[PDB]
């Protein structure tokens, strides 16, 4: 009950009214947040047989309450409901009836409208999917199809609630975006979500049609709160659904639903004033197509009825319809040349739309010209981006899109870096617009470190063509120029712009960020600074929630950050514990990036702090991964780092005894690696670990009987070239004869006895041998 008394103290100071100051209540909250996050017993005591949730719910219903206080209560509650027992008890505890308690939890995001509150409520619904299917996107934990169908009736209640909230006009835009992010993360089994057939039921049901209505929206024309940030949340989850319809029976069915939606819209494309807005919703739809499931929409681009309606709304006198046509046709330009089958005619059209002076039309007319790139267009975007107070963030998003399309040229990149106040504009963009511009800003960082071509898989064949005068390499992609670009970007703060746009799910763009971060951590002087701005929080979240292709680079960037770092400053606690899972999955010897040595140096720094660090590594089946690098003969950086890792990992009690255990043949290599003693890197480890292993008597007996031809090894480490390897080894031999006298009896009768007595007459092993002599 000392637990039960220490939750009573923090209980009165949070809920039962013991506070004459806000920050001391914040102190009790931050104490409980640490307290529940440290043990499961914290989540037991704070639960208090369910006494927690009503205190919190009467806290949320304050209009006078600070933001960070309430969000702190949620940061406790979602940690509380990580138990599957407690969360399922929580789910229906808000109504004797089932589905109204379901809707009461789903409408918890509509209490307030700050971005932080809505992102933490989406963590609350996330932990529910983690309670039902027993799945985890954070720990790559697959669901159990046993327990999914065991409580299917709860799930259908939830899906109805969500597809109710998607067309519920009483719900604001930032919350509706967060619902869509829950469909992206937790639904798809291709993304490790709800299993097969579930998404087939959703398509067979009317929820897909709700999403198609949502893609046909804008903040300017809506029936319900939509922001411009919403569409990029829609288009990804639509492409992820296309990634989840694995059978061509179902892709047949998917094309069959969406054509009914489309042809109903074109049945409603009339010239009437009612009929204009269906043309505008078609324009909002097709751009949402091209941003995501590019594949289906081009099959609808070949429909030839489209482009005269594009001309009608361009000749219309409403400027909203013309600005939306500009951003339509600029999304039409693809990497498929049959888009030009529609696009070959509209080339001068936007060339005319720049001539109009409406700026909302103008910046959308500026992009695309940026796509087909000529340095004067960069001079023009220069004009829009530097103007901050006058222009809105909705306009200044499009200039970033135009400049990312301009950043394909190598020579314009240098003109970009020569500006500093541009970057001042970039940080004041990302920290004011938040996560609004992620595809494009990451597209720029990829172009700056040349991270698109960072898959240099084709350069191996290009130099095979050079094995046979004609081509043109370009000098602005030389390693020194990129070192200039990158040191300029780190000097003017790319990292806080990265974490402010990190609140999305865009694996296209989150790939582009990981690729840029990997080139950023190439140099050691700035990576401590990158860590100083929270880059570790960023990279770990990246390797948890990016594209699977980007996770290799994400963990590799994590590996470069912590190579020779002090891990206590660079990784506090919970941040350190989750480090093990990503990089142990990167150790594939058949891959062999220059990541493996970075991996092992990181882990060896990690293994020196605490037992909970090094214990969680063995659970990850790291040991068979480390042994194969430790079996290698050719490499030098790898095997000694695996040895120094395995040097530090013998502090763990159980691993110390797994090596002494009779099933393994590892103690052979701990001494034979002191014998092939051409180098000092591996010999120093295999003699220090030997000095640790031989303090145990049963470990000494397994040396002699299990090693044929052993005194040859000991005479080699006695008549020894290096001095440090030899002196560590001799104390690990000194404790042998201290242990058992029958083994020491097999030492005087052996060959090595004469060189042992030879060395004592010359440093530290001298009195070790003298101690050995006392046995007789």
Residue numbers in the entry: 136 to 508, 525 to 619, 622 to 915, 926 to 939
How does the study describe this entry?
Surprisingly, however, deleting the entire TPR domain fully abolished the chaperone function of UNC-45. Finally, we determined the crystal structure of the UNC-45 ∆TPR construct that represents a C. elegans UNC-45 variant in monomeric, non-filamentous form. The asymmetric unit of the ∆TPR crystal form is built up by two molecules. In molecule A, the UCS domain adopts an extended conformation similar to wt UNC-45, whereas molecule B contains a UCS domain that is strongly bent, with the entire domain and even more strongly its C-terminal half (ARM repeats 14–17) extending away from the central domain. Together, the wt, G427E, L822F, and ∆TPR crystal structures depict four different UCS conformations highlighting the pronounced dynamicity of the myosin-binding domain.
Structural data of various functional mutants clarify the role of the distinct UNC-45 domains in this process providing important mechanistic insight into its myosin folding activity.
